[PDB]
Amino acid sequence: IDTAAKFIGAGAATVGVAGSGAGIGTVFGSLIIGYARNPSLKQQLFSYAILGFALSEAMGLFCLMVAFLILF
Amino acid sequence: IDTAAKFIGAGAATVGVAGSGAGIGTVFGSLIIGYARNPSLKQQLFSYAILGFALSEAMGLFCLMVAFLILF
Amino acid sequence: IDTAAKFIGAGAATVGVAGSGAGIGTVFGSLIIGYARNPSLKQQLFSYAILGFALSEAMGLFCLMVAFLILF
Amino acid sequence: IDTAAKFIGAGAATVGVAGSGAGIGTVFGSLIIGYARNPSLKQQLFSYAILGFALSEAMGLFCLMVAFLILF
Amino acid sequence: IDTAAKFIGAGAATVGVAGSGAGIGTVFGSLIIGYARNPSLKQQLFSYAILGFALSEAMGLFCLMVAFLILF
Amino acid sequence: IDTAAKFIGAGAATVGVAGSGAGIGTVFGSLIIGYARNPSLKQQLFSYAILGFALSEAMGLFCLMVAFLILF
Amino acid sequence: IDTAAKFIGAGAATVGVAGSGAGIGTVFGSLIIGYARNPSLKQQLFSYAILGFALSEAMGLFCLMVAFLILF
Amino acid sequence: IDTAAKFIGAGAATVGVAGSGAGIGTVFGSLIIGYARNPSLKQQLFSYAILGFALSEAMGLFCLMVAFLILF
Amino acid sequence: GQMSFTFASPTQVFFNGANVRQVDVPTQTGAFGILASHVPTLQVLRPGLVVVHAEDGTTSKYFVSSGSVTVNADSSVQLLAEEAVTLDMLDPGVAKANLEKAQSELLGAADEASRAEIQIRIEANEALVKAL
Amino acid sequence: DKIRGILHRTHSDQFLVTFKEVGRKPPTFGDASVIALELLNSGYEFDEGSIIFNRFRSVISYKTEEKPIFSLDTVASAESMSIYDDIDADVLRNYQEYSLANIIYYSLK
Amino acid sequence: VAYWRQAGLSYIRYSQICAKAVRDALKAEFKANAEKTSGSNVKIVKVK
């Protein structure tokens, strides 16, 4: 029964990380739009984008770490 | 079966973090374009983004805390 | 096994909270672009954004109530 | 098992509110950016916002009613 | 056990209505921003918005009907 | 027990359509903001929008077709 | 129970395959917005739009391939 | 129960793919609107879009690999 | 669609109150194609090329320095340009020369105001060499 | 300088800046560019503006027409621009500035 | 507030710069009109 505990639960947890892929893609797309509007703030635009992407992927990786915990 | 149930329920529960990740990605991407349109003003442009990040993340992190409750 | 399926239902219930967080991220993100466009429109703009957050969070709160019913 | 199935089915039927929450957040953010673009048009703008928010909450309530049906 | 599976399957099928719940908020949200952009287009703007809301609800209700189908 | 599997699998597969129902909303919502900027060239813009609905609904309908195949 | 697992796993994996519907609607929706702002340069605009739709659909159809593999 | 857990867990972990697909759609749609707004700087804009696609696709691909890992 | 288009400069007058299908304009905050019934949008120009898609079918192309895209609620767009120049009279060799020279001046422009001036030069030269 | 001298002995205080070398050379936009730019360089808050000139009627007749200059951003952003979409306050102030320069050009000719 | 702004340069000064650049790119045969522009004819005398 532990096989289910380590597989079905962990798989359901794995959805969380890739769910935030939409968020990081949103960050990058908004970076595209911002660069289009003002192609001079890229040094700060990119920095803000990196910050946001880092936070979103960190959320995803948090869910993924919980998934790993369920597996082990 | 109870422990396997805790595992699978927690794995299904923690998926809520994805929503949080997408939300914070959305707000920070919005920050990108907002700053692009009107540079500086980070006294509110960055502040509001941090606020939205706080609310969005809290939504998911509270969800993962419920997964912790399921586990224990 | 009854409580087990309760907890699985709770894990399903927590997922309802996530979409609330995604909405909260979106409304706050719009506040960014909104302030970027009109800085003078702050009181009304911020108030409306808070209202939107209120509704979005209420959705997840209700789903949390459903999870409560599952627990009890 | 049927009662446990009712519990898990209600839990599965209540997550169908997350989409409603995300939609309501989208509505209110759009209201923000619209009010920024064309102030003093809040009458029609807030009319549209109330309409959309009502529809989203109605959808969430419908999912809640289906959850009620499953549980009882 | 087949009757038991009906409950959980119905809840899962009911999840599908949340997608339409978000979509209607999105299209109603656009009505708002478009009207802010050009108030003179109200007639056709509202017509297209009703079209989109109706179509999204059509897809959502099409999914939702499966829940009643499987339950009964 | 195979029939119960068909029930649960079909219920899960029906959840998919939600993504497309959200999608058909976005394409029509974009039509609103597009038609807003340039109310003319409806024929071209509407042609594109109709194709977009066909596309998203095709994806969701294929998901529901998979649900039916699970039923059989 | 193996066939039951085939059905439920295939149904669960099918959820992701139609989540790409929202993505492709967004891609197609952006083409509507792009054409509104720049009625010219459609060739490159539409080509990129196809490059994005095929991109989004490929991952969804890949998830569908995974779902079918689970069945077989 | 091993094969059953493998199948259902692999199906569950595959669900995450949808979020990455949504982000994949978002980035390319933003490329559409950016190229529409600013015809110049498209090459760098396209490179940024490619990077964003790669990032979100990787986020999804890890969960796809996790689904494969659970199955095998 | 019966959209009167007035493209004029202080020196020369181009299309004036003429029905045109589309007028692609090098406007700031992104380029937006003037339509038959585009939303009234008072936006300032940027160095670039304007393409007027005359209803007959031919599309004349001119280069614009700066100005205002005054599209009214009715089908009347007033494209005032400080320097409205056709593409032929521009010299490509000296265009490239000026672009590279300004790019060299960028480093020597110590003052941020002066660097901004050289930035305007290089932006105009970039659009110019794209035109040529 | 004729206008200056006529009002140099009554309204000299109201004079902020007076531009010479006018009429000797046929006016052009760049001249109006100089006038408007220096007008902005003064920094005076010219919320309301008014330009006065003898508009050419005929070879023998001229009319001293006056055209108002609603330079102020607040007045430029009135109910009339509720239906206008892309215009932002910053570029509206820029548009009013360019309008000032070009209306100076037109008035001179 | 692009590069020309936030430095102090107004849209009019930006127009002057781009206009001079455009007239520079004109061919020498067509540079006669660039000379015709001659926007420095007027002068400014500050009152005090």
Side-chain angles (χ1 to χ4, degrees), chain A residues 39-62:
Chain A
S40 177
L41 307 176
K42 72 277 301 301
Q43 92 289 60
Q44 256 185 303
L45 241 68
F46 190 65
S47 299
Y48 287 122
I50 292 304
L51 169 75
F53 145 74
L55 268 52
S56 309
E57 185 149 308
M59 285 286 307
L61 266 288
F62 188 50

Side-chain angles (χ1 to χ4, degrees), chain J residues 48-53 55 64-70 103-104 106-107:
Chain J
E48 191 54 55
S50 177
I51 192 158
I52 303 179
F53 66 109
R55 183 191 52 79
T64 310
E65 296 262 304
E66 180 225 2
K67 296 182 178 303
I69 309 174
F70 303 104
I103 197 59
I104 291 181
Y106 168 72
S107 170

Side-chain angles (χ1 to χ4, degrees), chain I residues 11 45 65-67 82 89 91, chain K residues 11 14-15 18 25 27 36:
Chain I
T11 302
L45 283 155
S65 163
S66 38
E82 173 144 358
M89 34 194 302
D91 182 70
Chain K
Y11 187 60
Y14 175 82
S15 181
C18 67
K27 285 170 51 57
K36 162 262 162 189

Side-chain angles (χ1 to χ4, degrees), chain A residues 1-2 4-6 8-10 12-20 22-24 26-28 30-31 33-35 37-38 41 43-45 48-49 51-53 55-56 59-60 62-63 66-67 69-72, chain B residues 1 3-39 42 46 50 53 56-57 60-61 64 67-68 71-72:
Chain A
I1 190 59
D2 57 354
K6 315 292 187 177
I8 145 183
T14 318
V15 193
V17 20
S20 178
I24 80 169
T26 297
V27 177
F28 229 111
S30 190
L31 171 69
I33 305 177
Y35 187 70
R37 189 179 309 107
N38 185 4
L41 307 176
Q43 92 289 60
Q44 256 185 303
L45 241 68
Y48 287 122
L51 169 75
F53 145 74
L55 268 52
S56 309
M59 285 286 307
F62 188 50
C63 193
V66 178
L69 168 73
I70 299 301
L71 181 61
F72 311 111
Chain B
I1 179 180
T3 308
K6 303 309 167 292
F7 276 55
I8 61 179
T14 173
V15 76
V17 138
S20 165
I24 66 175
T26 298
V27 68
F28 282 110
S30 184
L31 193 185
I32 300 178
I33 42 180
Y35 163 67
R37 166 173 288 267
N38 205 329
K42 59 181 302 179
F46 193 67
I50 297 308
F53 150 75
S56 313
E57 266 223 3
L61 300 186
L64 206 142
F68 282 140
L71 282 186
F72 325 114

